[PDB]
Protein backbone atom coordinates (compact mmCIF):
# COMPACT_ATOMS: atom_id res chain seq x y z
CA UNK A 1 0.00 0.00 0.00
CA UNK A 2 0.99 3.42 -0.69
CA UNK A 3 2.16 5.27 2.38
CA UNK A 4 1.41 9.03 2.35
CA UNK A 5 3.66 11.37 4.18
CA UNK A 6 3.63 14.78 5.49
CA UNK A 7 5.93 17.65 6.02
CA UNK A 8 5.81 19.34 8.93
CA UNK A 9 3.21 17.45 11.54
CA UNK A 10 2.13 20.97 12.81
CA UNK A 11 2.66 24.93 11.99
CA UNK A 12 2.13 28.37 13.20
CA UNK A 13 1.45 31.57 10.86
CA UNK A 14 0.87 34.91 11.45
CA UNK A 15 -2.33 35.76 8.94
CA UNK A 16 -1.11 36.93 5.58
CA UNK A 17 1.99 34.96 5.76
CA UNK A 18 2.57 32.48 3.66
CA UNK A 19 2.54 28.04 4.45
CA UNK A 20 3.73 25.10 2.46
CA UNK A 21 2.67 21.60 3.39
CA UNK A 22 4.58 18.39 1.63
CA UNK A 23 3.48 15.35 1.00
CA UNK A 24 5.28 12.41 0.12
CA UNK A 25 4.14 9.23 -1.57
CA UNK A 26 6.24 5.78 -0.88
CA UNK A 27 5.72 4.85 -4.64
CA UNK A 28 4.99 6.95 -7.70
CA UNK A 29 0.68 7.69 -7.90
CA UNK A 30 0.10 8.00 -11.79
CA UNK A 31 -3.20 6.82 -12.45
CA UNK A 32 -3.80 4.07 -15.29
CA UNK A 33 -5.44 7.46 -17.47
CA UNK A 34 -1.95 9.33 -16.69
CA UNK A 35 -3.60 11.51 -14.22
CA UNK A 36 -1.77 12.29 -10.70
CA UNK A 37 -5.46 12.16 -8.21
CA UNK A 38 -3.97 13.96 -5.64
CA UNK A 39 -5.98 15.79 -2.84
CA UNK A 40 -5.69 18.03 -0.23
CA UNK A 41 -8.58 18.22 2.25
CA UNK A 42 -8.99 20.12 5.21
CA UNK A 43 -10.60 19.19 8.55
CA UNK A 44 -11.99 21.44 11.42
CA UNK A 45 -12.76 19.16 14.97
CA UNK A 46 -16.07 17.70 15.33
CA UNK A 47 -16.19 17.82 11.12
CA UNK A 48 -15.91 15.52 8.13
CA UNK A 49 -12.86 16.43 5.75
CA UNK A 50 -13.24 19.32 3.13
CA UNK A 51 -11.79 19.27 -0.63
CA UNK A 52 -9.82 22.22 -1.46
CA UNK A 53 -6.98 20.85 -4.02
CA UNK A 54 -7.77 17.61 -6.37
CA UNK A 55 -5.51 16.28 -9.08
CA UNK A 56 -2.62 18.23 -7.74
CA UNK A 57 -3.65 21.80 -8.62
CA UNK A 58 -7.38 21.70 -9.46
CA UNK A 59 -9.38 23.71 -6.36
CA UNK A 60 -12.73 22.88 -5.91
CA UNK A 61 -15.85 25.10 -5.71
CA UNK A 62 -15.63 28.02 -3.19
CA UNK A 63 -11.70 27.21 -2.54
CA UNK A 64 -9.86 30.53 -2.36
CA UNK A 65 -6.89 31.31 -4.65
CA UNK A 66 -5.04 31.81 -1.79
CA UNK A 67 -4.75 27.82 -1.89
CA UNK A 68 -2.66 26.34 -4.60
CA UNK A 69 -1.12 22.45 -5.48
CA UNK A 70 1.83 21.29 -7.37
CA UNK A 71 4.26 18.51 -7.29
CA UNK A 72 5.66 15.46 -9.16
CA UNK A 73 6.60 11.85 -8.72
CA UNK A 74 6.72 11.47 -4.94
CA UNK A 75 6.98 14.97 -3.72
CA UNK A 76 3.44 16.94 -3.47
CA UNK A 77 3.02 20.53 -2.39
CA UNK A 78 -0.03 22.33 -0.46
CA UNK A 79 0.68 26.01 -0.87
CA UNK A 80 -1.38 29.24 1.12
CA UNK A 81 -0.05 32.05 0.03
CA UNK A 82 -1.70 34.03 2.63
CA UNK A 83 -3.10 32.52 5.60
CA UNK A 84 -6.99 33.76 7.27
CA UNK A 85 -8.04 32.82 10.73
CA UNK A 86 -10.73 30.22 8.88
CA UNK A 87 -7.81 27.99 7.24
CA UNK A 88 -7.39 26.61 11.06
CA UNK A 89 -7.25 22.81 11.18
CA UNK A 90 -5.89 19.51 9.80
CA UNK A 91 -4.71 19.32 6.14
CA UNK A 92 -4.86 16.15 4.33
CA UNK A 93 -3.54 14.71 0.98
CA UNK A 94 -4.63 11.61 -0.21
CA UNK A 95 -4.28 9.34 -3.18
CA UNK A 96 -7.27 8.15 -5.60
CA UNK A 97 -4.64 6.66 -8.25
CA UNK A 98 -3.83 3.46 -6.73
CA UNK A 99 -6.69 0.65 -5.12
CA UNK A 100 -6.52 0.93 -2.29
CA UNK A 101 -6.46 4.82 -2.07
CA UNK A 102 -4.46 6.38 1.56
CA UNK A 103 -4.52 9.68 3.02
CA UNK A 104 -1.26 11.13 4.65
CA UNK A 105 -1.09 11.92 8.32
CA UNK A 106 -1.98 15.17 8.72
CA UNK A 107 -0.92 18.72 9.16
CA UNK A 108 -2.36 20.64 11.98
CA UNK A 109 -2.07 24.58 11.12
CA UNK A 110 -2.78 26.77 14.22
CA UNK A 111 -2.49 30.59 13.34
CA UNK A 112 -0.64 33.54 15.30
CA UNK A 113 -2.39 36.38 17.00
CA UNK A 114 -2.30 39.18 19.65
CA UNK A 115 -2.60 38.62 23.50
CA UNK A 116 -6.20 38.15 24.39
CA UNK A 117 -6.91 37.99 28.10
CA UNK A 118 -9.90 35.82 29.35
CA UNK A 119 -13.88 36.81 30.16
CA UNK A 120 -14.00 34.74 33.19
CA UNK A 121 -17.43 33.47 34.28
CA UNK A 122 -18.57 31.24 37.06
CA UNK A 123 -21.72 29.03 37.11
CA UNK A 124 -23.01 27.44 40.62
CA UNK A 125 -24.83 24.02 40.61
CA UNK A 126 -28.25 24.04 39.42
CA UNK A 127 -30.63 23.26 42.06
CA UNK A 128 -31.69 20.32 39.83
CA UNK A 129 -27.82 18.78 40.40
CA UNK A 130 -28.37 19.72 44.07
CA UNK A 131 -31.42 17.54 44.69
CA UNK A 132 -29.40 14.72 43.03
CA UNK A 133 -26.94 14.72 45.42
CA UNK A 134 -24.27 16.08 43.82
CA UNK A 135 -22.44 19.82 43.31
CA UNK A 136 -20.93 21.13 40.03
CA UNK A 137 -19.10 24.21 39.61
CA UNK A 138 -18.10 25.84 36.21
CA UNK A 139 -15.18 28.09 35.37
CA UNK A 140 -15.40 29.79 32.10
CA UNK A 141 -12.55 31.10 30.52
CA UNK A 142 -13.89 32.56 27.27
CA UNK A 143 -12.03 34.02 23.80
CA UNK A 144 -8.26 33.59 25.04
CA UNK A 145 -4.81 34.10 23.57
CA UNK A 146 -2.79 32.19 23.95
CA UNK A 147 -4.20 28.53 24.89
CA UNK A 148 -1.76 28.61 28.15
CA UNK A 149 -4.27 29.71 31.37
CA UNK A 150 -3.83 28.39 34.44
CA UNK A 151 -7.44 28.09 36.60
CA UNK A 152 -7.04 27.42 40.45
CA UNK A 153 -10.24 26.68 42.20
CA UNK A 154 -10.46 27.90 45.77
CA UNK A 155 -13.38 26.95 48.68
CA UNK A 156 -13.05 29.47 51.63
CA UNK A 157 -9.67 30.52 50.23
CA UNK A 158 -8.70 26.92 50.36
CA UNK A 159 -6.59 25.56 47.09
CA UNK A 160 -8.26 22.63 45.63
CA UNK A 161 -6.55 19.58 44.18
CA UNK A 162 -7.97 16.53 42.86
CA UNK A 163 -11.53 17.50 42.23
CA UNK A 164 -11.68 19.44 38.94
CA UNK A 165 -11.67 18.70 35.19
CA UNK A 166 -11.04 20.86 32.13
CA UNK A 167 -10.76 20.71 28.65
CA UNK A 168 -10.03 23.77 25.69
CA UNK A 169 -11.63 24.62 22.72
CA UNK A 170 -9.84 23.84 19.55
CA UNK A 171 -8.75 27.40 17.77
CA UNK A 172 -11.85 29.34 16.90
CA UNK A 173 -12.08 29.76 12.93
CA UNK A 174 -13.57 33.32 13.27
CA UNK A 175 -11.03 35.24 16.10
CA UNK A 176 -8.11 32.83 16.29
CA UNK A 177 -9.10 32.53 20.58
CA UNK A 178 -9.66 29.52 22.84
CA UNK A 179 -12.11 28.96 25.38
CA UNK A 180 -11.77 26.93 29.03
CA UNK A 181 -14.04 24.84 30.55
CA UNK A 182 -13.36 23.81 33.87
CA UNK A 183 -15.36 21.73 36.63
CA UNK A 184 -15.18 21.41 40.19
CA UNK A 185 -17.03 18.75 41.32
CA UNK A 186 -18.35 17.62 45.33
CA UNK A 187 -20.88 16.01 46.71
CA UNK A 188 -24.05 17.84 48.13
CA UNK A 189 -22.87 17.80 51.95
CA UNK A 190 -19.40 18.84 51.21
CA UNK A 191 -20.61 21.49 48.92
CA UNK A 192 -23.04 22.73 51.83
CA UNK A 193 -20.13 22.54 54.33
CA UNK A 194 -18.49 25.58 52.52
CA UNK A 195 -19.29 29.25 51.71
CA UNK A 196 -17.29 30.90 49.34
CA UNK A 197 -16.54 29.44 45.64
CA UNK A 198 -14.11 30.99 43.51
CA UNK A 199 -11.69 29.98 40.24
CA UNK A 200 -8.57 32.30 40.15
CA UNK A 201 -7.75 32.09 36.67
CA UNK A 202 -3.87 32.97 35.62
CA UNK A 203 -3.02 34.11 31.89
CA UNK A 204 -0.43 36.34 29.82
CA UNK A 205 -3.24 39.38 29.19
CA UNK A 206 -4.03 39.30 32.81
CA UNK A 207 -0.96 41.41 35.12
CA UNK A 208 -2.38 40.03 38.18
CA UNK A 209 -4.73 36.58 38.43
CA UNK A 210 -8.22 37.27 38.57
CA UNK A 211 -10.85 35.75 40.67
CA UNK A 212 -14.49 34.99 39.68
CA UNK A 213 -16.83 33.91 42.99
CA UNK A 214 -19.70 33.49 44.70
CA UNK A 215 -21.54 33.15 48.07
CA UNK A 216 -23.61 29.63 48.35
CA UNK A 217 -27.32 30.49 48.97
CA UNK A 218 -27.05 33.95 47.36
CA UNK B 1 -28.52 19.81 -3.02
CA UNK B 2 -26.41 16.87 -1.98
CA UNK B 3 -26.33 15.36 1.41
CA UNK B 4 -25.75 12.17 3.49
CA UNK B 5 -27.25 11.52 6.56
CA UNK B 6 -25.76 8.66 8.35
CA UNK B 7 -27.18 6.89 11.36
CA UNK B 8 -25.92 7.91 14.83
CA UNK B 9 -23.69 6.66 17.34
CA UNK B 10 -23.51 3.23 18.43
CA UNK B 11 -21.77 0.84 21.21
CA UNK B 12 -21.51 -2.30 20.82
CA UNK B 13 -19.82 -5.25 22.89
CA UNK B 14 -16.54 -6.76 21.92
CA UNK B 15 -17.30 -9.73 19.45
CA UNK B 16 -20.56 -8.36 18.32
CA UNK B 17 -22.02 -6.57 14.90
CA UNK B 18 -23.25 -3.44 13.97
CA UNK B 19 -24.69 -1.77 10.42
CA UNK B 20 -23.96 1.75 9.75
CA UNK B 21 -26.59 3.27 7.69
CA UNK B 22 -26.18 6.20 5.07
CA UNK B 23 -29.02 8.12 3.86
CA UNK B 24 -28.58 9.54 0.40
CA UNK B 25 -30.46 12.64 -0.81
CA UNK B 26 -30.52 16.01 -3.62
CA UNK B 27 -28.58 13.58 -6.37
CA UNK B 28 -29.85 10.02 -8.22
CA UNK B 29 -28.45 7.54 -5.98
CA UNK B 30 -27.20 4.68 -8.52
CA UNK B 31 -25.04 7.71 -10.36
CA UNK B 32 -22.28 7.71 -8.03
CA UNK B 33 -19.78 4.83 -6.20
CA UNK B 34 -20.58 5.07 -2.23
CA UNK B 35 -17.51 4.98 -0.15
CA UNK B 36 -16.31 4.25 3.26
CA UNK B 37 -13.73 5.84 5.04
CA UNK B 38 -12.87 5.22 8.38
CA UNK B 39 -11.13 7.70 11.19
CA UNK B 40 -9.70 6.26 14.03
CA UNK B 41 -7.26 7.30 16.50
CA UNK B 42 -3.57 7.09 15.99
CA UNK B 43 -4.12 4.83 12.67
CA UNK B 44 -5.58 7.99 11.00
CA UNK B 45 -8.19 8.41 8.06
CA UNK B 46 -8.07 5.28 5.61
CA UNK B 47 -10.18 4.31 2.98
CA UNK B 48 -12.55 0.85 3.66
CA UNK B 49 -13.96 0.40 0.07
CA UNK B 50 -16.74 1.49 -2.68
CA UNK B 51 -20.08 0.27 -3.23
CA UNK B 52 -21.18 0.47 -6.83
CA UNK B 53 -25.07 1.23 -6.05
CA UNK B 54 -26.55 0.02 -9.34
CA UNK B 55 -25.28 -4.00 -8.86
CA UNK B 56 -24.42 -3.97 -5.35
CA UNK B 57 -20.94 -4.87 -6.73
CA UNK B 58 -18.45 -4.04 -4.08
CA UNK B 59 -14.41 -3.18 -4.28
CA UNK B 60 -12.47 -3.63 -0.25
CA UNK B 61 -9.45 -2.39 1.03
CA UNK B 62 -7.33 -6.06 1.82
CA UNK B 63 -7.13 -4.76 5.12
CA UNK B 64 -10.78 -4.34 5.92
CA UNK B 65 -12.01 -7.57 4.04
CA UNK B 66 -13.88 -10.26 6.08
CA UNK B 67 -14.12 -7.26 8.79
CA UNK B 68 -16.58 -4.77 6.59
CA UNK B 69 -19.81 -5.97 4.58
CA UNK B 70 -20.81 -2.89 2.31
CA UNK B 71 -24.66 -3.47 0.97
CA UNK B 72 -27.30 -0.64 -0.25
CA UNK B 73 -31.37 -0.48 -0.83
CA UNK B 74 -32.58 1.26 -4.17
CA UNK B 75 -35.60 1.60 -2.90
CA UNK B 76 -34.99 3.88 -0.07
CA UNK B 77 -31.42 5.29 -1.36
CA UNK B 78 -29.51 3.94 1.54
CA UNK B 79 -25.98 2.74 1.70
CA UNK B 80 -24.87 0.64 4.37
CA UNK B 81 -21.85 -0.61 6.64
CA UNK B 82 -21.56 -3.46 8.34
CA UNK B 83 -18.50 -4.57 10.58
CA UNK B 84 -18.45 -8.24 12.07
CA UNK B 85 -16.21 -9.76 15.10
CA UNK B 86 -16.29 -6.02 16.72
CA UNK B 87 -13.07 -5.56 18.93
CA UNK B 88 -11.70 -2.45 20.25
CA UNK B 89 -9.51 -1.34 17.04
CA UNK B 90 -13.09 -1.24 15.36
CA UNK B 91 -13.49 2.21 17.57
CA UNK B 92 -13.23 4.81 15.03
CA UNK B 93 -16.33 7.43 12.92
CA UNK B 94 -17.39 5.63 10.02
CA UNK B 95 -17.92 8.25 7.11
CA UNK B 96 -19.83 7.64 3.67
CA UNK B 97 -18.60 9.94 1.16
CA UNK B 98 -19.18 10.29 -3.04
CA UNK B 99 -17.20 11.94 -5.62
CA UNK B 100 -19.95 13.67 -7.93
CA UNK B 101 -17.55 14.68 -10.63
CA UNK B 102 -17.38 10.27 -11.62
CA UNK B 103 -14.02 9.89 -10.18
CA UNK B 104 -12.74 8.73 -6.91
CA UNK B 105 -11.98 12.21 -5.10
CA UNK B 106 -14.73 12.92 -2.91
CA UNK B 107 -16.45 15.92 -2.41
CA UNK B 108 -19.58 14.87 -0.38
CA UNK B 109 -19.36 13.61 3.10
CA UNK B 110 -21.82 11.74 5.55
CA UNK B 111 -21.72 13.51 9.22
CA UNK B 112 -19.94 10.62 10.55
CA UNK B 113 -20.96 7.87 12.52
CA UNK B 114 -18.90 7.03 15.95
CA UNK B 115 -18.71 3.16 16.85
CA UNK B 116 -17.47 2.36 20.18
CA UNK B 117 -16.72 -1.22 20.96
CA UNK B 118 -16.35 -1.54 24.61
CA UNK B 119 -17.44 -4.30 27.49
CA UNK B 120 -18.85 -1.22 29.67
CA UNK B 121 -22.37 -0.30 29.68
CA UNK B 122 -24.10 2.75 28.17
CA UNK B 123 -25.26 5.56 30.37
CA UNK B 124 -27.22 8.59 29.21
CA UNK B 125 -26.31 11.71 30.58
CA UNK B 126 -27.87 14.21 33.05
CA UNK B 127 -28.32 17.33 31.44
CA UNK B 128 -27.89 20.77 33.84
CA UNK B 129 -28.57 24.58 33.15
CA UNK B 130 -25.66 26.98 33.37
CA UNK B 131 -28.26 29.73 34.34
CA UNK B 132 -26.96 33.33 33.08
CA UNK B 133 -26.64 35.45 36.34
CA UNK B 134 -24.18 38.57 37.66
CA UNK B 135 -21.53 36.23 37.62
CA UNK B 136 -21.77 35.24 34.39
CA UNK B 137 -21.86 38.62 32.57
CA UNK B 138 -19.14 40.83 30.79
CA UNK B 139 -19.60 43.85 28.88
CA UNK B 140 -23.23 43.67 28.36
CA UNK B 141 -23.17 40.16 27.47
CA UNK B 142 -24.49 37.34 29.24
CA UNK B 143 -22.99 33.41 29.38
CA UNK B 144 -24.70 30.75 29.46
CA UNK B 145 -24.99 26.67 28.55
CA UNK B 146 -25.73 23.17 29.38
CA UNK B 147 -23.90 21.04 31.71
CA UNK B 148 -24.04 17.46 30.38
CA UNK B 149 -22.82 14.98 33.02
CA UNK B 150 -22.09 10.99 33.14
CA UNK B 151 -22.44 9.60 30.13
CA UNK B 152 -21.15 6.75 28.15
CA UNK B 153 -19.63 6.09 25.45
CA UNK B 154 -19.29 9.42 22.95
CA UNK B 155 -20.66 11.65 21.62
CA UNK B 156 -22.89 14.34 22.84
CA UNK B 157 -24.02 16.93 20.23
CA UNK B 158 -25.68 19.91 21.81
CA UNK B 159 -27.11 22.49 19.16
CA UNK B 160 -28.96 25.86 20.56
CA UNK B 161 -32.29 26.66 19.40
CA UNK B 162 -32.82 23.91 17.09
CA UNK B 163 -29.73 25.04 15.13
CA UNK B 164 -30.74 28.54 14.76
CA UNK B 165 -27.94 29.82 17.30
CA UNK B 166 -24.30 29.27 16.29
CA UNK B 167 -22.85 32.70 16.99
CA UNK B 168 -20.80 32.62 20.23
CA UNK B 169 -21.41 28.94 21.02
CA UNK B 170 -18.61 26.75 22.46
CA UNK B 171 -19.10 22.98 22.88
CA UNK B 172 -16.28 21.51 24.32
CA UNK B 173 -14.25 18.38 23.90
CA UNK B 174 -15.56 15.95 26.49
CA UNK B 175 -13.72 14.74 29.80
CA UNK B 176 -13.15 11.02 31.14
CA UNK B 177 -14.34 11.67 34.46
CA UNK B 178 -12.43 8.41 37.19
CA UNK B 179 -15.96 6.96 36.76
CA UNK B 180 -14.98 6.22 33.10
CA UNK B 181 -18.08 8.44 32.14
CA UNK B 182 -17.94 11.09 30.13
CA UNK B 183 -18.62 15.04 31.20
CA UNK B 184 -19.07 18.18 29.13
CA UNK B 185 -20.30 21.71 28.62
CA UNK B 186 -21.52 23.65 26.40
CA UNK B 187 -21.90 27.95 26.25
CA UNK B 188 -23.36 30.53 24.62
CA UNK B 189 -22.70 34.25 24.98
CA UNK B 190 -25.73 36.12 24.42
CA UNK B 191 -27.03 39.61 24.87
CA UNK B 192 -28.02 40.57 28.58
CA UNK B 193 -30.10 43.48 27.69
CA UNK B 194 -32.79 40.66 26.37
CA UNK B 195 -33.04 37.74 28.60
CA UNK B 196 -36.55 38.62 29.91
CA UNK B 197 -37.25 38.17 25.70
CA UNK B 198 -35.46 35.21 24.12
CA UNK B 199 -35.45 31.44 25.47
CA UNK B 200 -32.38 29.50 25.28
CA UNK B 201 -32.98 26.15 24.62
CA UNK B 202 -29.99 23.71 24.51
CA UNK B 203 -30.77 20.36 22.15
CA UNK B 204 -28.61 17.57 23.65
CA UNK B 205 -28.15 13.74 22.07
CA UNK B 206 -27.22 10.78 23.23
CA UNK B 207 -27.61 8.82 20.80
CA UNK B 208 -25.74 5.60 22.06
CA UNK B 209 -28.30 5.47 25.29
CA UNK B 210 -31.26 7.20 22.82
CA UNK B 211 -31.30 10.52 25.18
CA UNK B 212 -33.08 13.41 23.78
CA UNK B 213 -33.32 16.31 25.91
CA UNK B 214 -34.18 19.95 25.05
CA UNK B 215 -33.26 21.86 28.50
CA UNK B 216 -34.58 24.96 28.43
CA UNK B 217 -31.85 27.69 30.08
CA UNK B 218 -34.15 30.06 32.46
CA UNK B 219 -32.24 33.26 34.22
CA UNK B 220 -31.31 33.83 37.43
Redesign the interface.
Known amino acids: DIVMTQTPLSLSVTPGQPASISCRSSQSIVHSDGNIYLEWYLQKPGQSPKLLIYKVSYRFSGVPDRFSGSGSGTDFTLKISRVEAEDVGVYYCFQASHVPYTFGQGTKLEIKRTVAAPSVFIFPPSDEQLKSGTASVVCLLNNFYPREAKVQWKVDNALQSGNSQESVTEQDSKDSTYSLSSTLTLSKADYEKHKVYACEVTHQGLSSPVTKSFNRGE | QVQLVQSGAEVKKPGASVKVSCKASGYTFTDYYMHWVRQAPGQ????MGETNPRNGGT?Y???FKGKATMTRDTSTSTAYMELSSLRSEDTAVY?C?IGT?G?????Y????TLVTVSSASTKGP?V????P?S?????G?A?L?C?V?DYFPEPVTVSWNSGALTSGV??????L?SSGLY???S?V?VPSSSLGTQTYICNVNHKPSNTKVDKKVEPK
Open positions: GLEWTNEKYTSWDYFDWGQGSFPLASKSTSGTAGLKHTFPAVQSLSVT
